[PDB]
């Protein structure tokens, strides 16, 4: 479900690390700058996948470190629209249902895309669903959060960059839907 | 305190009534005494008002309005044939147009 992103960078290798093969030292110094961070237009970087090319290791004047331009590919969790995923409920809230996908927690099920039978919680945090035959409106998305299946209808990037001179909002947002048949808790289908 | 130039060469022969010191800068949109003339109305001047709005809505739909091409669509899907933006194409008269412009 992931993608590769082809990226370039100039990596500074300091001179105490000259006792190590360069392809090992470069990869470590790249994971330290990319892992668990969102790169704006492309998504959340998991780790470096491989180095595809490695240019000349210049030494610039006034420093002793070596600078080398690296060509590399990185595994990034970018899910395409209308994809099916499975994940666990962390919380119920008035604004909707919040889903976790392992590492990723900013998954929104909006109430405009929830199941139609029940749509306004009666002063309760937990969301509800009513079926006439079974369960009299007490069926619920439990706080323990047994895995739901959801379909990612929308995603948005918000540019979390400094405004004004210098001297926490979620930068990657994902919006699901659950209204289709076959979506929901796994035990329902 | 005196300045570099002599103030008597500018004026002020009496020795008083120098202009005051501006404290706050003047506002960006100062108030004006005069107002615009109200518009011309009529059965003929309003028909030009409606024809002007019908030329925007038509010339955006006519084939001369070359829209910018889309790119970097992520994946292919079966909803591509259902969502293909169909529009007929105009062709010029290549006698008048130069040879250097054939597509």
């Amino acid at each position: 479900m992931f993608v590769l992103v082809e990226m370039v960078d100039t990596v500074r290798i300091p001179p105490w690390q000259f006792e190590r093969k360069l392809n090992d030292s470069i990869a470590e110094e790249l994971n330290k700058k990319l892992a668990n961070k969102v790169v704006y237009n492309v998504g959340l970087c998991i780790c470096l996948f491989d180095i595809t090319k490695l240019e000349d290791a210049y030494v610039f004047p006034g420093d002793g470190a070596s600078h080398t331009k690296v060509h590399f590919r990185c595994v990034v969790f970018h899910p395409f629209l209308d994809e099916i995923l499975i994940g666990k409920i962390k919380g119920c809230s008035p604004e909707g249902v919040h889903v976790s996908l392992g590492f990723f927690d900013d998954i929104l099920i909006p109430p405009e895309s929830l199941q139609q039978p029940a749509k306004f919680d009666e002063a309760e945090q937990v969301w509800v669903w009513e079926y006439e035959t079974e369960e009299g409106a007490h069926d619920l998305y439990m706080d323990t959060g047994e895995e739901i299946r959801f379909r990612v209808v929308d995603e948005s990037f918000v540019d979390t960059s400094p405004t004004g001179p210098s001297s926490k909002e979620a930068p990657y947002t994902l919006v699901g839907s659950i209204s289709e048949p076959g979506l929901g808790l796994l035990s329902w289908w | 305190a005196a300045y570099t130039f002599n103030i008597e060469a500018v004026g002020f022969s009496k020795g008083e009534k120098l202009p005051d010191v501006v404290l706050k800068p003047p506002p960006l949109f100062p108030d004006t005494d005069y107002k615009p003339v109200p518009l011309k109305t009529g059965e003929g001047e309003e028909y030009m008002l409606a024809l002007k709005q019908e030329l925007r809505e038509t010339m955006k739909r006519m084939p001369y309005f070359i829209e910018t091409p889309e790119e970097r669509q992520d994946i292919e899907r079966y909803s591509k044939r259902y969502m293909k933006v169909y529009k007929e194409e105009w062709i010029p008269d290549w006698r008048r147009l130069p040879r250097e412009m054939m597509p």
């Binding site: 700058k33 961070k37 | 300045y3 570099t4 004026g11 501006v22 404290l23």
Partner: protein, 538 residues
């Protein structure tokens, strides 16, 4: 969780493109509008005013009071601009000779450039060739303006275009109505008789009307230059992405940050010029309301042009006697130009630290590559030795001795920190134990340091050479007299300079390239200069 951001975007300057700001880009840079003439409040609190010059929204030039825009001290702040609005346009004195040039090329009636279709086609294709250099542009401007001056009628509107020339300090005149002994031309004959209302009431018009001409002025030339077609702007050799003809006439003026003009010179001459500009802008604005005569308004405008021009360049030649400054003042041009200006005094050469000076005296028991440095200079001139596996146990002993014993150290600095611990205080035997790799110990100058050595007048490269220091008790600098001939030194109370290179790369370039053993022969004829002298020849 967090978004990626690059940590430290170091970049390299690729080129400087010069240009000029439009009056409405000035308003977009500047943080405040300046309107008040008074430097300081009248009351004893000694605050500056909120919307006058010396306002701390434009930065600070004293540690006592911080900048308002970014809340940061003198050491941290780059400075910020304000602007002054000018009620009437003025010529910029640096661009004035270029203002006339354009008015000699453009038609004064429709603002098209006075060239035929063929000459326009020619020069526009000259300006296409890749790699057009600065000299070729200056030559092309001459040939373009040459043709425009030999034409007297416009190909586009047909109006007559006489000579444009200077007519005194910051004034321009256009000879639209020349007159000749021949049969009188139609259009000039209409103008000469239009004066009928003036002649009825003013007798003196009738001699002087032969000398009546179009007095070009900033209110007109700003209105012409807005109307020049953008197709014809490249043929004036103006680059249309660095500026426009409209920008050459200043209707707005930036005031520099306070750190350009520090608070105790009290105020700098730029700050007092800007007061006078603001005052005269209030004089002119009031006289328009109170009904002064045109003789007064024009004179005041003439003052505003002078005060702006003397703000930029205070050495103007043609200043009338009833307008001349009583005192000399630094304009911007005077602090750029000359021996004590920026380019010679502060940019090409500058005062440097880790330097010393003393009387020189002989010592033949030193080698020719050595120089004796007194202990009093060696305890001051420190070299930053980076701590590593080869020198850790050596630098510990130097840290223990501390500032007062000669093989010692004045400062210690931790790995990723930029403050410096002054090693005179604290217990040095504890600070020696807590040395880590990557710390910097600022040790004293010791035997075997590469040190630069230079007599004050330098006529050739051998007047500055690198020597290995050796520390000795007496105060003078000392070297073997075989090296007197390169320095032209004579030990009669002569003084010489010493520089301690603060970088490992600067040691190597000094040692390999500038060492005395590498410089036994002069570059000129290849003859030896370090050799025997008197009492070594006898």
């Amino acid at each position: 969780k967090e978004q990626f951001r690059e940590t430290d975007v170091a970049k390299k300057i690729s080129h400087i493109c010069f240009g000029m700001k439009s009056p409405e880009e000035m308003r977009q840079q500047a943080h405040i509008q300046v309107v008040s003439k008074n430097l300081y409040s009248q009351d004893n609190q000694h605050a500056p005013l909120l919307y006058g010059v010396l306002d701390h929204r434009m930065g600070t030039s004293e540690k006592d009071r911080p900048c308002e825009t970014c809340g940061k001290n003198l050491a941290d702040c780059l400075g910020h601009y304000g602007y002054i609005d000018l009620e009437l346009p003025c010529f910029h004195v640096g661009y004035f000779r270029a203002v006339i040039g354009i008015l000699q090329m453009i038609c004064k009636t429709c603002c098209h450039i006075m060239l035929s279709q063929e000459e326009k086609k020619q020069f526009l294709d000259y300006l296409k060739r890749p790699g057009l250099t600065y000299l070729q542009k200056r030559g092309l401007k001459k040939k373009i303006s040459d043709k425009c001056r030999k034409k007297n009628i416009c190909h586009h509107c047909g109006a007559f275009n006489g000579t444009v020339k200077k007519c005194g300090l910051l004034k321009i005149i256009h000879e639209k109505y020349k007159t000749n002994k021949k049969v009188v031309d139609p259009i000039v004959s209409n103008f000469l008789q239009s004066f009928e209302t003036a002649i009825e009431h003013n007798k003196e018009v009738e001699p002087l009307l032969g000398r009546a001409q179009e007095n070009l002025n900033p209110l007109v030339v700003l209105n012409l230059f807005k109307r020049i077609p953008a197709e014809d702007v490249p043929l004036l050799l103006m680059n249309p992405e660095a500026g426009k003809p409209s920008d050459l006439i200043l209707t707005r003026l930036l005031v520099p940050p306070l750190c350009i003009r520090p608070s105790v010179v009290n105020e700098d001459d730029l700050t007092m010029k800007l007061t006078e500009i603001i005052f005269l802008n209030d004089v002119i604005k009031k006289h328009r309301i109170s009904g002064a005569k045109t003789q007064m308004i024009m004179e005041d405008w003439d003052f505003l042009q002078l005060q702006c021009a003397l703000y930029i360049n205070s050495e103007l030649s043609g200043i009338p006697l009833n307008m001349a400054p009583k005192k000399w003042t630094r304009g911007f041009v005077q602090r750029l130009k000359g021996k004590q200006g920026r380019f010679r005094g502060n940019l090409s050469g500058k005062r440097v630290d880790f330097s010393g000076r003393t009387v020189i005296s002989p010592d033949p028991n030193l080698r020719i590559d050595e120089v004796a440095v007194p202990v009093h200079v060696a305890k001051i001139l420190t070299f930053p030795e980076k701590v590593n596996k080869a020198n850790i146990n050596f630098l510990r002993k130097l840290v223990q001795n501390g500032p007062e014993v000669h093989p010692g150290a004045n400062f210690i600095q931790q790995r990723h920190t930029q403050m410096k611990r002054f090693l005179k205080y604290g217990n040095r035997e504890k600070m020696a134990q807590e040395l880590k790799y990557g710390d910097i110990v600022e040790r004293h100058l010791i035997d075997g340091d590469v040190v630069l050595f230079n007599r004050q007048p330098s006529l050739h490269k051998l007047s500055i050479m690198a020597h290995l220091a050796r520390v000795k008790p007496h105060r003078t600098f000392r070297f073997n007299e075989c090296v007197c001939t390169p320095y032209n030194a004579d030990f009669d109370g002569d003084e010489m300079n010493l520089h301690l290179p603060q970088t490992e790369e600067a040691k190597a370039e000094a040692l390999v390239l500038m060492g005395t053993k590498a410089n036994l022969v002069t570059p000129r004829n290849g003859e030896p200069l370090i050799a025997a002298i008197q009492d070594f020849l006898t």
